[model samples]
Target: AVVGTGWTSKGQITVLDMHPGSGKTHRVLPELIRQCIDRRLRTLVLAPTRVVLKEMERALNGKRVRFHSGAIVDVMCHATYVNRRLLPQGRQNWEVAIMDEAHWTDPHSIAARGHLYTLAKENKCALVLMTATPPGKSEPFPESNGAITSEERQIPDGEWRDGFDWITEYEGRTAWFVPSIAKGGAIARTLRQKGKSVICLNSKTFEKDYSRVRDEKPDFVVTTDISEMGANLDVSRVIDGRTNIKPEEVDGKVELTGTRRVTTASAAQRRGRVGRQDGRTDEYIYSGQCDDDDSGLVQWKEAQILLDNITVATFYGPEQDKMPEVAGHFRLTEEKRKHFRHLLTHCDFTPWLAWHVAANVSSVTDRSWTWEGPEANAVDEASGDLVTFRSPNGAERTLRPVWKDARMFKEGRDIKEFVAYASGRR
Candidate 1:
């Protein structure tokens, strides 16, 4: 019943929303594939990551399923690999195309969206976009019908604990979600030194470590957000070393900066890992290493102001270009450019232009070009300025430099000050 009655009609675009670890992959997806097989319909399954793809392949028992190895029967592949390999050739033919983790395919990756649309449009297939996190207002998809189902489980905030002390307090099976793989490994090593069985799960350890974790069911598993999405780990409690925000001094000014935290969305996703099947509420321990200071809170408020101002301008203002300018003014890093691009493209601007602004602002402060390399001090023939770096490939690469006098830069600064004052940051 995952597809529901009349859900498989031709030319139908359905949005399937369900919680993570909600048996969507194992139960629902397999059922849908079986139905497709029974109907003799060609189906193409696209997942965001290889981990999920391999999991889906296993769930399907590899029967009549063609993985990314280029097969015609029940094609299953990672979306990126498919886009890179098969999409350009336009050789896809399928009656159904299911996009798993569809929320990950935001406007920042326009090609993915376009490729999906192409498959659905040209092949006249039923398009199923699945995700636990529902698309925001900015990611509008053409849908004939949609289903939103909550996992039969609940996650409540457990406790805020300090760093290694958390391990001593709660000894039950714990999954520590760290910020990076290096941190995960470091924590795992420390826990092992304490005579605790720990497994570090990330891309590097996925192939070698995943099976061991699955088979043995260790006491503590340290992992990153990348493995947190679809990989299921059995744990009664979750320990998160990742903070919502961190403060760093930028140019002698302490700016509450770091792309670690934005909203509670990702935190919510991480919390969903536990209490998945048992319906038992799991404990979430927030190990506050990147704890926010007073300045961090102020900067968070300032970021909220920037988001608010940009949101209003993007949603209602006559000038849409103002969004990127405001983003650059906040000194948002290149990592956040995708956030702005998604917001703007969701506001109805062309995807190409959205990406252009996002890339330009993040890489070039004033949209000016200057080379930097071993010959960076060499004089430039065009602008009569010393080159910062020489291009080894004989092509100028994108660089990041703030052009203070540029119109966009000035406007961005002004906007930043205005938003800061309005938000009481000044």
Candidate 2:
């Protein structure tokens, strides 16, 4: 009944792929650790998020395994704890190395996947890339943008690549079931009726309001942030909101949203939800009426345009081409570009302006308010209120309605009118 009796004893790298909600985290990960311990195999657990790491520790708590505290302890411990940064400095043997959120190691970003490779080599480790989303190929950019093409892209499939063994994808086929007869309102009602534990990933307001799901152990947790790589919930079913938005509608149902916005690299992190440590099924429900086909796709367009501008410009950009150095830095090429263009279609300014603003705004800083101008200003103008902006640098300011002035230019003014109209657009 034991899985892989001969091969594991032979001391070769073993790859296991598990579907979402299969209890792989509670079941398989523990078994892997126990097997490694049984064979006297020194293991290192690499988790992407603190939440996941903590969960693993809890699962392995009762076992007699020695776990390392992130401090400067002795190198030889029964089990060594590590985040993305923790790797063996000198030559030390690790029988099994588990990398949680393995997909986030983008070679193109400051934290490249290569860092993991170096860590794996130095430790002489048996590396396991435990992630739900396997890294996909980066979208191609034109030569004019100074971005690398498919040929120049670095392939990480088999060449001792990124210091990990072969990727064994173990997925289960399970349809995310929401009653077809049930609408958004009913989904929430049923979640509450079933008395299930639900969590919502959206609304910092909701997160701030309720610290935990509930005091009286609920049946379902509704959430927007559960798409990838985070704390694993014990719920049996994940109710994805295909078109659920308004918090009141599917507020209590488990919803999943894409990590990528119209522009930015954060989408890279969102794909990590779903399968963790293998053998589980993830149901991604797309709301049919809500333009689910176009909802997440628009963000990719915004990302690639910014990535293109950064690679081309020397000073403002990251000053290097980081995409090719890593695999799956981005997803969706042409559609993303088209989506960025679609956003620009409403504005009369050059396409480059939208690209520049989107890139500079999202890439360089942490300000969420500053990025919204046409959208925010329009919202404010319609509501007869001033749009407040808190700069990433901490300066507080309010931007008045500039759409009126911009609209005036559409009648008789020129580029100068458009340029002078909005202060935040710059």
Candidate 3:
């Protein structure tokens, strides 16, 4: 499946999409790396999550593999440490860079794309962006292909008992999926009481139980949406605990609120979990009611609305205006800068800040700051030492300043103390 791509050729940026368990890491990536090794070309494989990187390392048996964060340096490193720390510190030589789960290159995550772009542009490296869901853009990677083949399956219906019975009849691996970690834990405990060996994977168990579950290969794996993407568990049946929507009253008003139904895309991804390797008949069962008339599930119309509302922003801040010298150190082009400015106009400050904080390197020190004395409290003439500040979410933050008069402030003592006190209040 991978040899047809002509990846050995020079200066090629290929966007390849394949099913979750289509052997991208096991077959395609290994072959590509082997070709690179044969040609003596340096290759770097960038994975979105550390779990993916670890899985790749296990598959390759540590063949010239290096982790980008905290691990030993080899040939391949993670994108986060490489882009944010390594590239900035003069480590930018690679013949090829492969981004696994590359759909993460949204407008909001500008830094991920920015650093990858910088690496490709500066090093003249060929790039391979892999994802199950590809963006509609073509300028980034003109050469693209997908190796996805799907089969239609009926959504199972019944109670939790019926779902468990159906799972027992599978005679193979099964994954019973829940919406959240709390629900998954409850399900796991119930299944365990029934003498079934079930492995639970979610936010809480991912760190401690992933390795164990992968090695043990339990009969039933109870998990949440965390396993919806980038996971290739060999399961023959999927018992989905579909989210049920119900109305509740809030603040003297009736509001429609409950667990939302899974989207079509989510269902497709979950269904893809089955029928990966073996051609056996895979079953997908739903615990909750599967009503055709339900409007809670995100359909095409809702997805389109979300896509239209999406926006991006850059890491540039107000401080950058006064510090052009520091900003110039970042290897961002005029075109890219303009894209950031234009996108920021369409996005809110809080959302923009969230993306910026995730993508950019932090400059603030992690050490604790302290208020030196109580004498720093100052009086306010307007509200008698009380002031009102509005947060982004429309909440008011009322506090008193450290000092009433601005003239009494000293550079080293007053400013530091004032900052420390304000930080705690804010």
Candidate 4:
């Protein structure tokens, strides 16, 4: 049903394609990270959204393995994780970095995703990108990173249907799955107006809403997609409203509400919201038609985000020449690269300012915009700052980050660890 506990390929890119309802995320993932602790490797766990990430943090909070080694297990908000992790070995250049719900890459921001790629390939550490949807094969992350390995699993058997007959009697405690907050809220209101016990799940009300679901069962639960991704909510019916959503000015406020052909993989995840373990007739209802294939319209959405992704790579990544290798993942054009280059040194923007701006526009929540570069105390060339660098097999040296003439290597070792045995004379 999942990667075995004996899965010891602890150093490589692992693309695990497991169907929903499989005990991969909660069961297997925690074990593997615990496995990392057993091996004394510093691990970084990343989830696509803060809700998912918070659940992950909650899961692994007290789950620790102690020892003399300084490194251990950790998790964070995906954006915050990247900004902090990429800064120094790029602290915690992470001996192993695992990404959950990898299919949400575009929404996850290509910058953060690319940095994950960099950690696996360039940093030569283990990276596990696991998802049920798999983000479709068109873009990157699957086969691109050299040797590929996987533990692909299939979807569990269940009664599937399309849409719901409003006049029907076949229903139990159902989780009405919608893609946007507005629709979820509106639907919950409509259901509750009829005096149906309903729970509305969303970022704004996640704490209280989830509490209601966990502590008390509701006849009808309306929620955004995040709940199905990790929430272990067992229900009788899964009313999946995961159609393409668009923003509209409704009631004089902007809101996301629309529908279209949904991705089969995501559709499967929503379908899995009923929780497969309990043996009962689980009914899955979709708002519209869903096919096996996914998206191209949204790939471009994240493509533009990659501009910030690769730009950060140019700065923090020691090998500036490897930009193309990273770019090749998306078939990024020279024109975009040139534009990205302009942001780098076009006088209109500083390396710090341009790089900083590029990062923010790409979609990361709670991002520290005022954050300087990876080396916070390091070089801001336009302002003349200095930081640490090491070349390929090169000596640890502190220099201006903007020094285009020199190649540097930095990562893997902790400054604190090295400084203890440091001779300040050097």
Candidate 5:
């Protein structure tokens, strides 16, 4: 049995620790964002990979929240939910900074995770770093067997810390059991009778095998290794089990196949599959080990190794100064100052001036690059020098002609760099 309410807060961090196979991503992230919005905070959601970022963007956009992107900006500045036009020409303040898969920060990259830290600090933002594998630092002044390390003890606890504002930690539990391999019929009936929805993950399992799992809607979905990661589904219950292994004589060969086995991480992710956002309740059904020799013991051992390593490493070094408490008084370091020196002098429209021109100047479906109109129409030209289109509001806009030279080549290059770095690019 499990019971909890709201988001469990440990220190300044809010924790959502669920068993593997329990649905949390679809259940947790949006809730966290909604809570942040309820507090009237500006939220910045970060994901580990580009693909995850795209998914997050899709999810958030679907919620009717405004979002901005490079393509959207190029086509129409104000078209996106987030307007690049509204962005601060230089450094703008932010309310919150979220780091998903926060453990993957590249310590040495100035333009990657380091830039994120800088943005958070400069904006005086509340930082939320989420990751299943946060690295661990020994605690206590002098550490021994979970004791504080000497260096850490030098600084008193709760003293003014230079790193993260707070950390919320959550640990998941695992159960080991042996699943019945009665070829699906009886087991399927039992699961449906329990009022559960079964789903077959598409990533790992074959389509044919997945079809069999889906036919019953058995309240629990089973798939090979590939189905687990990436998407968020409501996973309310998890029934852990071991792979069936038949014994063979010394000279005989034993084959191991067609069994249900899951890694600790994948299992944990699966447990999160059910009970997503609408505040639905769910449970896990772990059948424990069949015999006295259950791998749960081993799972627990590996879990400790995993738990011990959970911690957030601050990207900003000790020397980095905090953002000014007063608005309009913040200043950047010499290094960061140099990075934005050129942009500091440009007009608000300068950064996007080229993109704006390109969108207005380019011909439809033409691969030609240009800043200036072509001197004469090419023999193969399908359209004239330039084309005009009407905006939703009935405003006529000209589309740049294809195969034309750009008059602002140098200006465009600078603008590109400005936009890239301003958006946290190198």
Candidate 6:
């Protein structure tokens, strides 16, 4: 059935690791709600996303959690819960806080996970974490993250079967997971031509698109990775479009392209959609490949996300603000807090510049725009275009680039010639 709930003391987190298609949602959660209602315990339920919260509400039907008179159980997604969206109701002390879809807490961004973990710990409430799949990678429970250094229980044998089979390059009630939306739309169009009521969700319009699939009950649903988490229809056939990008050869030169080979963690969740309605085997096709169970890969990179987010959080505001109190929500070790404090205080990056550089860390990557001549006319990151800056001994030097200046650089309006820009003035 379900697990044994919670305990006393602050920072008390208990993870419930149940199999997918198991009663984690339908049975376990509902049972916990009943217990809470019976005891009249004030509980806060944290769904991973707003959309999932709405879906949970709908699933509950008349059995109320939000507006129940007997007990106090509030449902808020990770984002709204942190911002105190409900104000008074949100800020209240709760006996327990349960995070549904707790898979996202680890193996991904720490943005919401750390915040909720901190919130429950600070308020001295029990934290319950449930996942899309327990004891598995990709869609795993919250154990490796330091924020959840507590006991976890793995309940049930393999009662909940995968209830589906994976097929490829071939034969549903067919469903498709094309990571590229451009092609997903095309697949849906073709499916429509073949006389199936099809729905296409391309991550761009997930909230609205899933609705069309839900209400219309489309025969075929084509989607991107967004299909991995969001609830889906019970299609008999699923096409897991496993694709990889690499350089391909056809002629003298080679170009990089995406290829769908005959092979595809969160992906498992995609296939789990099939045979959901019936307790029998269905078809799930794998087109690409996945790490399978690369535990080492997940292990090394698991908790780093929360740390990375915590470390750079101060970049949001001015130096004087010094990351504010809540910035520590990602659970920086005390020794490093002082280090982080000094680390943040030393910088004087403006809000705009910090925002761009931090957010676009990858986008504003490398360009070989040198700082100009060998005698020391600086190449430009600023906009002189062709100012031909000369470096004076110790002074803050000016820079510019000229056309055909250096053959070493690439070409274009960028000139690629040593290639650089100028300062604000001239």
TM-score, one value per model: 0.55, 0.39, 0.53, 0.57, 0.29, 0.53
* lDDT by residue (tens digit), candidate 6, 1-426: 555645323467666765455556667777777777667778778766557777677766566577311437787765445434212233566777777765442222233444445555565566777754432334322122112111222211112223222222223366666645556666666555555677877545676677777678767787665655546565666666554222222232122345333112455566656645434556655533554432222111213323333422322111112222344344434343333332223332212212222332332222112233243434443464443432333334333221112211211113332212222121
- lDDT of all predictions, in order shown? 0.49, 0.35, 0.47, 0.49, 0.32, 0.46
Candidate 1: stretches off by over 4 Å: 69-73, 79-81, 85-87, 105-114, 117-123, 137-164, 241-258, 287-426
Instruction: Decide which is better by lDDT, 2 or 6.
Output: 6
What is the per-residue lDDT of model 3 for residues 267-373, given as tens digits with 9 covering 90 to 100?
A: 54556566555344556665433322322222212112212222121121211122212222433333333332322332221222212222332322211211221
Better of 1 and 5 by lDDT: 1
Order of models, best lDDT first: 4, 1, 3, 6, 2, 5
> Model 5 — which ten-residue stretch has the worst lDDT?
70-79
Instruction: Give the per-residue lDDT digits (tens) of candidate 5, residues 132-231.
Output: 4232321111101111111111211121224421110112211112222232334344434544343444322332344454344334554333233333
What does candidate 4 score in Cα RMSD to the true structure? 16.4
Regions more than 4 Å wrong, model 6: 5-12, 58-64, 67-71, 83-93, 105-109, 118-123, 134-171, 193-196, 243-264, 292-354, 357-426
* Backbone clashes, each candidate: 9, 39, 3, 5, 49, 22
Model 1 per-residue lDDT tens digits across residues 97-208: 7777664422222224334444455446677877654434321111111222222222122232344364655657877776555456666777776677888776456656
- Report the C-alpha displacement of residue 262, candidate 5, in angstroms: 20
Q: Give the per-residue lDDT digits (tens) of candidate 4, residues 149-184.
A: 211222111223334245134456777776556566
What does candidate 2's lDDT look like per residue over 209-327, in tens digits? 23354343334444433233444443323333232221110221112232222111112222223333334333322222222122222222323333342222111122123323222
Q: What is the lDDT, from 0 to 100, of the residue 291 in candidate 2?
A: 23
- Pairwise lDDT winner, candidates 1 and 3: 1
The C-alpha local distance difference test score for the whole of candidate 4 amounts to 0.49
Global fold similarity of model 6 (TM-score): 0.53
lDDT of 3: 0.47
**Quality of model 1 by C-alpha lDDT:** 0.49
Report RMSD for candidate 3.
13.5
CA deviation > 4 Å runs, candidate 2? 1-14, 20-23, 35-42, 48-50, 62-96, 101-114, 117-124, 131-199, 203-211, 214-220, 225-227, 230-238, 241-426
Q: Which candidate is the best by TM-score?
A: 4
